[PDB]
Amino acid sequence: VKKIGITQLVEHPALDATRTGFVKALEKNGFKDGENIDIDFQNAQNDMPTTQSIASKFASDKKDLIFAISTPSAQAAFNATKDIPILITAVSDPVAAGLVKTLEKPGTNVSGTSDFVSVDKGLELLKIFAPKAKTIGVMYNTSEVNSKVQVDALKEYASKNGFKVVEKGITTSNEVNQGISSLVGKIDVLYVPTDNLVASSMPIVSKIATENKIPVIAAESGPVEKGALACQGINYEKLGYKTGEMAVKILNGESVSDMPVATSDDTDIIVNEDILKALGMEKPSNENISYVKTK
Structure with missing residues (x-):
């Protein structure tokens, strides 16, 4: 069984849609919720301290994967762990946020998708x-x-x-x-x-x-x-689905420091x-x- 944490900053049409798509990508690739995965969804509700709580909680939960939605949600995730894979989305600038060494070659535990x-x-x-x-x-x-x-x-x-x-x-x-x-x-x-x-x-x-x-x-x-x-x-549901396909890669084996940051595309x-x-x-x-x- 798999433990996946989703940390979102706030309820918002764009951010909400990346969630929806991420889940669907897992479902079509055979990872149904409460079957061989369990999804820990945490909304920070636009509270900037509570992004840190959710990070720290997920670290000491020893989650298999941390899907992070928004730059602040993703930053907090990076503080709490440097050994759990952390897939970002809805982040304009990963290098300016300090989540990744270079956009092409991660060199860390943090891949995913930009929304630039x-x-x-x-x-x-x-x-x-x-x-x-x-x-x-x-x-x-x-x-x-x-x-x-x-x-x-x-x-x-x-x-x-x-x-x-x-x-x-x-x-x-x-x-x-x-x-x-x-x-x-x-x-x-x-x-x-x-x-x-x-x-x-x-x-x-x-x-x-x-x-x-x-x-x-x-x-x-x-x-x-x-x-x-x-x-x-951008179609954020698709950017989510993309990021959800990058999850299935990490679950079934791939190392996240090698995985390059895929982009808007559509x-x-x-x-x-x-x-x-x-x-x-x-x-x-x-x-x-x-x-x-x-x-």
Whole structure:
């Protein structure tokens, strides 16, 4: 019989879906719950101390495998053991989190899947939603450290592909309406990074961008649902299933320090149906595109 611990940070559609898929991969490969495996599911419920508890508990439980969902959940797992295999998922940056020596060759007890989506993947959509675009807009928070990383990525994409960039650096939420408005007439497309300031004030940005025919490309599905045009979001159930297939490999034998970190692979284009009609644009004819409505 097998003891598998699942440590999740919080209940959340993306994270919940990686769980669902991970289980299914085990089931189709013959590891039914309470038959020859037992799954210890622990939600930390967004309590950051309780991620540590779950880790330590699973260490002294001597679990066969620790499936960890989210960067904090995975970090806590790494503290509590350096001799139980720990499969991650929903972690953007494994090397910056300190879970793995290099992405290709683990050199530790920690393999799994990343949920990273590059600025490159996102801007493949310029072809579809902003054809012959010359100049990309980007509004972002100077305070948020991971935004300027994402903006530097965009300037480096822009430079290398022949686009110009227009930046609005802002700090406070009240500056937004003014910001997005100052970008009217100067940009062919706006890119919304994963950035708490701007991701949270979408209903405003949606309004002012859509009124001037400006397409809004987002780095994830959340801002699409709330009035951005499209994103290159991941199917988290599939990223889970992938990670669940990597489990079956460890159970039936494989050594996890050799196992390389598999990636998103299957990412689907998610388009806001409604925002599309409001831009006067018609649906792309490639049928492998998903659609959603605003809130």
